[PDB]
């Protein structure tokens, strides 16, 4: 047990793309999505 | 369209849409709109004849009028034919079909063609927009053939429109694929398409089956060609 130190320190080597690197990654474990039953509503 | 013409000192200034709720609600098209300046371009002002040089020249009423009495007065029967044009009012209509009947001819014609076979012209509802404009916001499903209703008909394709939009009607086109401003299910071009759907060998017949309200609009356009009674 310590508080003398920082432990959020893992955003200090973030790139541009690490946001949308872990949607990429996380885009498997999603269940399907819902349809409205069109493809857009100006169909 | 019913529109106001708004005049000053004996001069056309504008044209305003005036309310219609079965016919053009409150809008109107461009050339409703501003095509009045035409009014004032290449306008006919006086009779004319040809002269001895055979150009035409401005002439009194009296001299015109006795002329084509007398050309009028020599021939008869079939030699005496009149074509009517785009605008034309009813009561010019039926003052000519009268003095080429006191004549004994009857070649009265329109330029725009519409087939003769069968009924033809003997029954109105064979030339009619049966269905009317306000009850296009009824139907489920209409088939367009051979017709681009944005440019012929601006106003009835913003009454399709709003039911496309409203109503969630099904729109399908046979013919162009041009532009309506709304998706619709192109069927093509080919108008054999039309007996394929008649025949039921096509998708398309089974869903004007099922629908309760079905309407088939067919443009005067398409009856223009050669095979317009096919």
């Known amino acids: 047990f310590d508080n003398s ?27 399907p999505q819902p349809s409205s039953g069109r493809q857009s509503p100006r169909h | ?126 030339y009619l927009l049966n269905t009317t404009i306000a009850g296009v916001e009824e139907a489920d499903v209409i088939l367009l053939v051979g017709t681009n209703p944005r440019f012929e008909a601006p106003l009835f394709n913003a009454r399709i429109r709003k039911s496309w939009l409203h109503n969630d009607l099904k729109v399908a086109l046979i013919g162009s694929p041009v532009d309506l401003t709304y998706r619709y299910d192109h069927l093509g071009d080919s108008p054999k398409i039309l007996q394929d759907i008649a025949s039921g060998n096509h998708p398309f017949s089974q869903i004007l089956k099922e629908a309760k309200k079905p309407m088939v609009v067919l443009g005067s356009s398409a009856l223009q060609r050669s095979d317009g009674t096919a």
């Not at chain 2, 006919?44 to 009296?62: A, D, F, H, S, V």
């Not at chain 2, 009947?101 to 009857?106: G, H, I, K, M, P």
């Open chain 1, 5 to 31: 130190t920082y432990r959020n320190l893992q955003h200090h080597e973030y790139s541009t793309y690490t946001f949308l690197d872990l949607n990429v990654e996380l885009s498997k474990f999603r269940m």
């Open chain 2, 1 to 126: 369209s019913n529109i106001v013409v708004s005049t000053r000192t004996g001069e056309v200034m504008r044209i305003l849409p005036r309310m219609h709720e079965d016919i053009n609600e409150e809008w109107i098209s461009d050339k409703t709109r501003f095509a009045y300046d035409g009014l004032k371009r290449q306008r006919l002002t006086q009779p004319m004849i040809r002269n001895e040089k055979g150009l035409l020249t401005y002439t009194t009423w009296e001299d015109a009028l006795s002329r084509v009495a007398g050309m009028l007065q020599s021939f008869q029967g079939n030699d005496v034919a009149a074509i009517a044009g785009g605008l034309v009012d009813a009561e010019a209509l039926v003052a000519l079909k009268d003095l080429l009947n006191r004549v004994d001819s009857d070649s009265l014609c329109t330029e725009e063609v519409f087939p003769t076979a069968g009924a033809g012209t003997d029954l109105r509802s064979n």
